[PDB]
DNA sequence: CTGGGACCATGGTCCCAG
DNA sequence: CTGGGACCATGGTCCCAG
């Protein structure tokens, strides 16, 4: 099963050109809900760094990828930072699975840091 | 007492005009250690928004303004973004207070902290 | 057209209790 | 050990409202 990130790349191009950016058009073409295209496409927007955090790109579900991207909209730099920070954890040997990555990543946006 | 940020602005001007980039010159003028000028100036270099995180600009110490500035040098976007974040949180009713603010901003750079 | 909300069955994990 | 209940996130679909 190709990764959400991957699908998103394809969906992305097919939109810009093959369908004049008509999500609905592409959807029918791919014979799949529009949301699915949205979710994956937004995932493909995530920084290459953030993708790397996962062993296998398939570990980043379209659903979480989508939410991640929306969450860090207009804050790509913050995202990139967090991403690197986590990269050092594993660099220093630390290990956390998929489900955690998104959490730790998103953490910076949550107040539970101090409260 | 005029806040560091304020002093910073005034200093930087005289520095750019009345004394053509010569800290020592300005220092002699204001009759205060060069360090002070440096601290305030860097403080005035902080994004309006970052200053805005505090009720009164006076809440931002020259000392912190300085460290904050140096800390995020060549990372102004990151700072602005992280400032937004903290702005949205207190927008959602969260409450911070001076000391906590500067610490929160800086947390982003810390591998241990952010993750 | 488009995004978002309400839903859905599924593969799958945990863990309790015979 | 073994089955079953309680959950869970996911991929998806529908369909409403801007």
From Swiss-Prot, chains A, B:
Residues represented out of the complete protein: 157 to 271 of 323
Record organism: Escherichia coli (strain K12)
Start-end of DNA-binding region: 24-43
Family in the record: Belongs to the ParB family.
Signal peptide: none
Lineage: Bacteria, Pseudomonadati, Pseudomonadota, Gammaproteobacteria, Enterobacterales
Note: Overproduction of SopB protein causes IncG incompatibility.
Name of protein: Protein SopB
Transmembrane parts of this sequence: none
Record function comment: Control of plasmid partitioning; required to recognize the cis-acting. Binds specifically with the DNA segment containing the sopC region. SopB is trans-acting.
């Amino acid at each position: 099963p190709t990764s959400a990130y991957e699908r998103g790349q394809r969906y992305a191009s097919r939109l810009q050109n093959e369908f004049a950016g008509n999500i609905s058009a592409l959807a029918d073409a791919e014979n799949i809900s529009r949301k699915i295209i949205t979710r994956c496409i937004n995932t493909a927007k995530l920084p290459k760094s953030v993708v790397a955090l996962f062993s296998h790109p398939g570990e980043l579900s379209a659903r979480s990828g989508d939410a991640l991207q929306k969450a860090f909209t207009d804050k790509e730099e913050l995202l990139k930072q967090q991403a690197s920070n986590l990269h050092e954890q594993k660099k220093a040997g630390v290990i956390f699975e998929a489900d955690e990555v998104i959490t730790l990543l998103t953490s910076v946006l949550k107040t539970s840091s101090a409260s």
